């Protein structure tokens, strides 16, 4: 199974300023994942371009599962992201009606 470290859209320890530079002028559905500001292992933050803004979505992690809200149903961050490449986040929040379309790639 592909690891999070090897995902093209996972940038690790980068700042919001760096994220905002990468998302400037990008279309809706542009996205990346970075480590959460808490700097706690297993805590990550999805940044999604929508409406010219950079929306921050916490990735929750409990009991070996991940997700945006309870119930947490995904076995990895990679599985969570790949799911929303093909389903809108509108289910999580009506203001996030886009799929994850355009990864910001580190490769």
């Amino acid at each position: 199974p592909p690891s999070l470290q090897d995902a093209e859209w996972y940038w690790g320890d980068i700042s919001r300023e760096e994220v905002n530079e990468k998302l400037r002028d990008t279309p809706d559905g542009t996205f990346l994942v970075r480590d959460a500001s808490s700097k706690i292992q297993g805590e990550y933050t999805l940044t999604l371009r929508k409406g010219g803004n950079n929306k921050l979505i916490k990735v929750f992690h409990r009991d070996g599962h991940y997700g945006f809200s309870e119930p947490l149903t995904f076995c990895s961050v990679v599985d969570l992201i790949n799911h929303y490449r093909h389903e809108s986040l509108a289910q999580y929040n009506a203001k996030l009606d886009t799929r994850l379309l355009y990864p910001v790639s580190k490769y």
Partner: peptide
């Protein structure tokens, strides 16, 4: 902050 619930 700019976190979406």
């Amino acid at each position: 902050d700019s976190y979406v619930g």
